Amino acid sequence: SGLKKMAQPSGCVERCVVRVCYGSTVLNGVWLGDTVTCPRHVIAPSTTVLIDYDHAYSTMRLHNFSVSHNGVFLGVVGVTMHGSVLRIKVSQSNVHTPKHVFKTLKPGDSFNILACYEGIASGVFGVNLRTNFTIKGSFINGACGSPGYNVRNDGTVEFCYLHQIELGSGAHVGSDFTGSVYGNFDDQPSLQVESANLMLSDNVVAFLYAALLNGCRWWLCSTRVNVDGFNEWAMANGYTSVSSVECYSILAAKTGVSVEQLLASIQHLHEGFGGKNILGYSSLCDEFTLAEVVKQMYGVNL
Amino acid sequence: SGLKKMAQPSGCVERCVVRVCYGSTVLNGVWLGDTVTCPRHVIAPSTTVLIDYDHAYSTMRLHNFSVSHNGVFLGVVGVTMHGSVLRIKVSQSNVHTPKHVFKTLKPGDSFNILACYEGIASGVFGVNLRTNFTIKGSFINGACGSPGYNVRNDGTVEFCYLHQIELGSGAHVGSDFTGSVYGNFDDQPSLQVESANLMLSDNVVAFLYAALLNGCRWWLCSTRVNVDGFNEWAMANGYTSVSSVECYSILAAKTGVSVEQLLASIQHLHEGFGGKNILGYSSLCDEFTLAEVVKQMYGVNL
């Protein structure tokens, strides 16, 4: 038993992290096959003024790069720029490249972040992409290029995130491996601000099922609500729509409680917990996905 | 910025996890040099009655073991029993044994768990050893033998925990690599219940400093209480004593807030936040050490 936000193991991703340096600027990259992908920030000139990346790219010289894995330097063959990332062709392939694909996350998706500094991983944690296209992680100077990944049920690594910048608000912004910044934020300092976060209803439903399976049921509500009604309430109260109901069948069967009864319970609990808690939480928890709850409680995939 | 409970990267430990089978029973072991350490539960008979491990060990037959790392079959040369673990000598040394030591944890220590099933890692998360010598993890059937570790600055891996059992209460119990069970709980099913844990005051102070440094200060009390005063209050309210304000000097300086002001805040907050949160937590958090907070937020040591 227990429900804890965890990361999928990081070994296969650690073996792909590299240190990328251009002039004095250092950040992290990901080495897959004969290509290193990293944020284009690495070629920015030192200045406080707006960076013109097209000009930075045109004045770029290959000899200014150094790329290394565990202190072993790689030859740089060529560099191209794609959105907010660089693709650096190197002169040998990573022999420890995992079976992998590239995936662009959608809000509500869980993934793992490997926080790296100077091409060496320091921490790994699970995180959710928020409705405002940011995450809440923990990064300090040098974390740029820290990768996000998921490992599919079949073992394939999905590469989905490269850390780009922290907004003034503290929100964390990354791009996918194609260079598209999640939420269309600028990949350089600015005054941009993310939209207000919405609670992930699908995850709250999963959380309440976990609570029921632990004998915590004081909060169950007997009012009638359907998905359409809940979704209208959600829009008015800072919650996402619930996506669907049937996917919860494994948990609905184990508990005898329908998703619609949980939706009614969310509406009630919005009023307050009146000093009580659910699995130790004093407010609704949207940290855990359905997949996570089923995996952690029953050891199976959906 | 940010503060998030993370795990240290798991790669070097994944390379030491093996599948250990005895008869139909499968669990996890840790392969270092030519020895695999695993919980002695692996040789228990299938029963609901009390297990006599001395008898089980006396009747053990080496041929019944199957030990493997990723399809690499390891020949069993001999087995000895030490407290709650077996040391299985195998015919091959793990050439990926990391620089390591064995370390016995004390309450308040943070470490990492690699949750494994059938010799394969599934998740990694950080935990903190409670005053009752249990942890709050997430484990289901098959997790026995999942290792806990901490990586020192010089890269030395401290192997500190092997998962043993979940109590009826849900608390998680493990042993060290010498075979001593943390808290001296029984390593088989029983009606044992862990003693009540105390909130780790030193860790809460570290957490509140982290909150301040991340701009979260709604909870900050306007008054102060001295260490002696807090300590008398703590004894009556299920908190550990705070010993010295001096170790907090660096964060007190960065924030302009004294430990005494944080201690007064704790007293006001010890029953909950209502519906509010601090760094995503519904109530006071004692999961982070001072060293952990400083390392994560400033990349330095104490």
What is the structure's resolution, reported in angstroms to one decimal? 1.6
8 A C-beta contact, residue B172 and residue B136: yes
CB atoms within 10 A of CB A161: 30
Report the 10 Å Cβ neighbour count for A168: 11
Of B142, B164, B197, the position where a domain reaches its end is B197
CA of B233 vs chain A CAs: smallest distance (Å): 22
User: By CA distance, what is A299's nearest residue in B?
Assistant: B140
What residues of chain A lie within 8 A of the CB of B142, using their CB?
A: 299
Q: Are residues B12 and B41 in the same domain?
A: yes
Largest CA distance in chain B: 69
CA dist A190 and A192 (Å) reads: 6
Residue B140 tokens read as 């289901």
Yes or no: say if A115 and A139 are a contact pair by the CB < 8 Å rule: yes
Helices (H), A166-279: 201-213, 227-237, 249-255, 259-269
d(CA B251, CA B244) in angstroms, rounded, equals 14
**In the listed set A197, A227, A259, which residue is the last one of a domain according to the structure?**
A197
Please report, for the domain that includes residue B290, its CATH number: 1.10.1840.10
Q: Which two tokens stand for residue B177?
A: 């690599």
In this structure, the answer to whether residues B240 and B295 fall within a common structural domain is yes
Residue A201: phi and psi, rounded to 5, are: -55, -40
Point out the catalytic residue in the list B16, B41, B69, B285. Answer: B41
Contacts of A283 in chain B (CB under 8 A): 275-277, 282
- Are A122 and B9 inside 8 Å of each other by CB? yes
Nearest to B275 among A117, A121, A273 (CB): A273
Q: What is the DSSP letter of A183?
A: G
Backbone angles phi, psi at B93, to 5 degrees: -90, 145
Question: Is there a single domain that holds both residue B219 and residue B259?
Answer: yes
Secondary structure (DSSP) of B132-148: TS-B-----TT-TT-EE
Do residue A203 and residue A299 come from a single domain?
A: yes
C-alpha distance from A55 to closest chain B C-alpha (Å): 31
Q: Which residue has the tokens 């088989």?
A: B188
Residue B115, C-beta contacts closer than 8 angstroms, at least 6 positions apart: A6, B121, B122, B123, B124, B125, B137, B138, B139, B143, B146, B163
A138: nearest CB among B12, B170, B296: B296
Chain A residues lying within 8 Å of B117, measured CB to CB: 299
Domain co-membership, B128 together with B185: yes
Same domain membership, residue B118 and residue B73 = no
Are residues B1 and B91 located together in one domain of the fold? yes
Task: Using an 8 Å CB-CB cutoff, list chain A residues near B139.
Answer: 1-2
| A134 and A72 both lie in a single domain | no
Residue that finishes a domain, picked among B142, B175, B197: B197
Asked if residues B246 and B205 have their Cβ atoms less than 8 Å apart, the reply is no
For residue A180, what are its two tokens?
A: 């598209």
Among A3, A4, A140, the strongest candidate for a mutation testing the B interface, having the largest count of B CBs within 10 A, is: A4
CA angle A86, A92, A96 (to 5 degrees): 90
Which of B114, B138, B142 is closest, CB to CB, to A296?
Answer: B138
Angle at A180 between CA A176 and CA A185, to 5 degrees: 110
* Alpha carbon distance A175, A160 (integer Å): 8
CB-based burial of residue B263 (10 Å sphere; 0-12 exposed, 13-18 middle, 19+ buried)? buried
Q: What is the CATH number of the domain that holds B44?
A: 2.40.10.10
List helix spans (H) across B176-245: 201-213, 227-237
All residues at 6 or more sequence positions from B168 whose CB lies less than 8 Å from its CB, including other chains: B191, B192, B193
Q: What is the CA radius of gyration of chain B?
A: 22
Question: B173 and B248 share a domain?
Answer: no
Contact flag B9-A275 (C-beta cutoff 8 Å): no
- Residue B161: is it exposed, middle or buried by C-beta count within 10 angstroms (0-12/13-18/19+)? buried
Both B182 and B209 in a single domain?
no
Per the listing, tokens 């304000």 go with B245
Separation CA A268–CA A263 (nearest Å): 9
Q: How many structural domains compose chain A?
A: 3
**Inter-chain CB proximity A11 and B6 less than 8 Å:** no
Do the Cβ atoms of B251 and B214 come closer than 8 Å?
Answer: no
Residue whose tokens read 């912004």:
A173
Active site (catalytic) residues of A: 41, 144
Whether residues B54 and B8 share a domain: the answer is: yes
Rounded to 10 degrees, the C-alpha dihedral A54/A59/A60/A62 comes to 140
Residues in chain A: 302
Print the domain residue range for A162. 99-197
CA distance B138 to chain A (A): 4
**CB–CB contact A9 B114 (8 Å):** yes
> Do A276 and A228 share a structural domain?
yes
Interface test with B, best of A111, A114, A130, A138 (most B CBs within 10 A): A138
The residue from B16, B144, B160, B285 that is catalytic is B144
